[PDB]
């Protein structure tokens, strides 16, 4: 008895199908290793072979000090690699590339266990409150001139359809993000990634990763990274042609002064008087075009040459590093029509 594009919704993030798809893809043994012997305690010992591993990478520990490290990570998360011998973890992208398996099989985990524990049932069990924005609305109207307005040239192997959008106010997030509500440069920025991310998502909030995790991959470290050009974030989504309806948030994030750096720092502790990290892009929407809903900076003007050049990013990235710096406001269905 929920609307229609909702019950789709609960149905597309709590998926088993969908699931089990991510764990031969990341070729994870389903006979050795199902969804329902996947605990939280053998989570944090994942990263404990990451943690104290990648801690032996950058002097290269020599199989005398490895190959045993190596060895009881495959005691916890077994992995079928056909009938080849089993990669090592001791060089640069494994330990790496292992670290995005955990932090989708975190969520994963998150996922089964909400769907197990205790389709209504299951919506009741992400704390949060899902409405349709309809198609007609400003409230639907100002959502769209930003996807069509925000789409980049570099990330234009895609159109981007916008199926439904809904609104979404988690348990809590309300209460904690009171305190940062004042807080001056409140921005409603994109937000992508894997839909079996977003039972972890809207039931647990958007988290920072764990300090157990490994150290790059995270360009600025640990805190919740957005953005301005919808693609940018579209892109984690990691939505193939395969399955080609992805999620991606909006959210409310009060900023405040942005620690304006054209260059990766492992951020571990912002300067003081500094709210947020601002990767600075070349390309960012005509500053003119930035329309206000609330107190908060919709950005979603086009893409104009802010020939600023003493840069690596072309498109911003926005960093908080305290997870009531957030307030997500809507989950967007957009569709990903590829072109090769
Ligand atoms: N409750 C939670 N518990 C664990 N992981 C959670 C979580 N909520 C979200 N996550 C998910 O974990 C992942 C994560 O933190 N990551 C992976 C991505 N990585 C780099 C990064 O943030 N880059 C980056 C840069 C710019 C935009 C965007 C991103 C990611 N998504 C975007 O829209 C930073 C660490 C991510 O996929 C997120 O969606």
Same mark, same amino acid.
């Given at each position: 008895? *929920?609307?229609?594009?909702?019950?789709?919704?609960?149905?597309?993030? +709590?998926?088993?199908?969908?699931?089990?798809?991510?764990?031969?893809?990341?070729?994870?043994? *389903?006979?050795?290793?199902?969804?329902?012997?996947?605990?939280?305690?053998?989570?944090?010992?994942?990263?404990?072979?990451?943690?104290?591993?990648?801690?032996?990478?950058?002097?290269?520990?020599?199989?005398?000090?490895?190959?045993?490290?190596?060895?009881?990570?495959?005691?916890?998360?077994?992995?079928? +690699?056909?009938?080849?011998?089993?990669?090592?973890?001791?060089?640069?992208?494994?330990?790496?590339?292992?670290?995005?398996?955990?932090?989708?099989?975190?969520?994963?985990?998150?996922?089964?266990?909400?769907?197990?524990?205790?389709?209504?049932? %299951?919506?009741?069990?992400?704390?949060?409150?899902?409405?349709?924005?309809?198609?007609?609305?400003?409230?639907?109207?100002? !959502?769209?001139?930003?996807?069509?307005?925000?789409?980049?040239?570099?990330?234009?192997?895609?159109?981007?359809?916008?199926?439904?959008?809904?609104? !979404?106010?988690?348990?809590?997030?309300?209460?904690?993000?009171?305190?940062?509500?004042?807080?001056?440069?409140?921005?409603?920025?994109?937000?992508?990634?894997?839909?079996?991310?977003?039972?972890? !998502?809207? &039931?647990?909030?958007?988290?920072?990763?764990?300090?157990?995790?490994?150290?790059?991959?995270?360009?600025?470290?640990?805190?919740?990274? +957005?953005?301005?050009?919808?693609?940018?974030?579209? %892109?984690?989504?990691?939505?193939?042609?395969?399955?080609?309806?992805?999620?991606?948030?909006?959210?409310?994030?009060?900023?405040?002064?942005?620690?304006?750096?054209?260059?990766?720092?492992?951020?571990?502790?912002?300067?003081?008087?500094?709210? &947020?990290?601002?990767?600075?892009?070349?390309?960012?929407?005509?500053?003119?075009?930035?329309?206000?809903?609330?107190?908060?900076?919709?950005?979603?003007?086009?893409?104009?040459?802010?020939?600023?050049?003493?840069?690596?990013?072309?498109?911003?990235?926005?960093?908080?590093?305290?997870?009531?710096?957030?307030?997500?406001?809507?989950?967007?269905?957009?569709?990903? %029509? +590829?072109?090769?």
């Amino acid at each position: 008895k *929920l609307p229609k594009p909702v019950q789709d919704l609960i149905k597309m993030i +709590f998926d088993v199908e969908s699931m089990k798809k991510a764990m031969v893809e990341y070729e994870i043994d *389903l006979q050795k290793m199902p969804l329902g012997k996947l605990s939280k305690r053998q989570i944090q010992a994942a990263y404990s072979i990451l943690s104290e591993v990648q801690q032996a990478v950058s002097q290269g520990s020599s199989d005398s000090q490895i190959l045993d490290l190596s060895n009881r990570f495959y005691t916890l998360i077994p992995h079928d +690699f056909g009938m080849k011998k089993p990669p090592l973890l001791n060089n640069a992208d494994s330990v790496q590339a292992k670290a995005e398996m955990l932090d989708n099989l975190l969520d994963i985990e998150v996922a089964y266990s909400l769907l197990r524990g205790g389709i209504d049932v %299951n919506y009741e069990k992400l704390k949060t409150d899902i409405k349709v924005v309809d198609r007609d609305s400003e409230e639907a109207e100002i !959502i769209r001139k930003y996807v069509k307005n925000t789409h980049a040239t570099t990330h234009n192997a895609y159109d981007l359809e916008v199926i439904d959008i809904f609104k !979404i106010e988690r348990e809590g997030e309300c209460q904690r993000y009171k305190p940062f509500k004042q807080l001056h440069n409140r921005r409603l920025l994109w937000h992508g990634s894997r839909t079996t991310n977003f039972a972890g !998502i809207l &039931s647990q909030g958007l988290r920072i990763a764990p300090p157990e995790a490994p150290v790059t991959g995270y360009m600025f470290g640990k805190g919740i990274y +957005f953005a301005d050009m919808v693609s940018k974030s579209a %892109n984690y989504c990691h939505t193939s042609q395969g399955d080609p309806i992805g999620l991606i948030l909006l959210g409310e994030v009060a900023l405040g002064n942005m620690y304006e750096l054209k260059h990766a720092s492992h951020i571990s502790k912002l300067p003081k008087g500094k709210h &947020s990290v601002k990767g600075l892009g070349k390309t960012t929407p005509d500053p003119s075009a930035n329309i206000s809903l609330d107190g908060v900076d919709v950005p979603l003007g086009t893409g104009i040459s802010s020939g600023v050049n003493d840069t690596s990013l072309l498109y911003n990235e926005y960093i908080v590093y305290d997870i009531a710096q957030v307030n997500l406001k809507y989950l967007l269905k957009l569709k990903f %029509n +590829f072109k090769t």
